[PDB]
């Protein structure tokens with residue numbers, strides 16, 4: 001110390017001001033003004049929704065929730081499998097500083113109850129197939145006073161859709177392109193309450209999404225903003241890996257192709273036909289594609305990268321997948337729910353097998369001795385600790401669990417074993 005604290009380089013672009021709502025609003029308004037720019041594509045049903053459509057419905061949902069009465073003292077739950085509609089109430093609530101709690105749509109009723117007992121939402125957005133579970137949770141959590149169906153146009157089984165709800169509360173003359181997103185304190189207004197014994201609520205201020213948005217547009221730590229870039233994401237939107245890659249893709253103006261049910265031929269054909277440049281996989285899908293022999297039958301010449309993951313993958317698995325996809329390697333990244341997003345990212349092209357990446361801008365990371373907490377040195381194995389502005393502000397009504405994890409020095413103890421090498425690539429040791 002000082003040379004055993006690994007530091008992230010400066011951001012290519014300075015850190016934008018304003019809330020996460022404001023930066024999303026600003027970027028998506030610009031993309032909305034180009035007709036036909038695609039935001040999301042559902043691979044199963046083949047429908048595209050454009051930035052204009054997405055911007056206007058999100059702005060309308062923002063103003064409708066504001067006029068309903070929701071403010072920074074309220075939370076919503078968005079409970080739905082990955083869908084064209086998922087990010088509409090997410091964006092609307094961020095535009096007005098209402099915290100959003102994504103609800104694992106393959107939670108059973110009990111997992112659902114505990115998730116929402118922590119987040120205490122006033123309004124629930126849910127897909128049709130989640131409705132009866134929400135209703136049963138409402139019997140035990142009557143703070144849920146309003147339930148809105150996401151994947152309907154008309155009312156559904158007595159409940160308003162997002163479209164009928166918006167119509168009920170927009171003022172006459174509402175103009176989507178005059179709407180101004182709320183300004184408020186970036187550090188103290190919670191953007192997301194993510195789920196991590198029993199899961200905890202992880203409160204993430206807007207600031208931490210604003211920092212992710214720096215990483216997402218970064219030419220080294222994210223993606224170059226280039227027109228007609230398309231992503232294939234098969235990662236759940238309600239978990240932090242899918243939440244904050246997708247928001248970053250929206251701020252980049254990318255086309256986000258989604259699948260909520262993995263199928264081998266549909267995935268490969270979607271890579272081919274949508275000329276996908278980046279594909280996102282959960283760890284166990286890497287093992288799957290290590291076994292796949294169909295990859296050669298598809299034109300994947302546009303494929304530039306495959307990114308992971310919660311994980312970390314084995315070095316052997318990542319090398320086998322990379323070979324099959326005729327790529328030089330896998331672009332890994334590492335983070336926890338409590339760090340918002342990845343705080344260790346494989347730099348563009350700076351690719352190394354088994355490595356999880358380097359420290360991201362605004363962060364620092366070290367490896368401490370498992371017995372003493374002392375800062376270790378190159379290739380020394382110990383506990384990974386990270387410090388930076390994407391760390392959560394704490395667990396929700398659980399300051400004891402918060403303090404076990406983050407000291408007064410603001411260092412986050414990942415509970416993972418790690419080491420960094422000569423060129424400062426981090427590796428995670430599997431326990």
Ligand SMILES: Oc1csc(-c2nc3ccc(NC4=CC=C4)cc3s2)n1
Pocket residue numbers: 221222239240241245307308309310331332333334335336337340341342345346
């Ligand atoms: O558990 C948990 C919560 S958040 C999270 C991750 N976020 C990212 C983001 C990017 C990435 N890889 C970049 C994308 C170009 C390489 C890997 C990961 S892993 N994991």
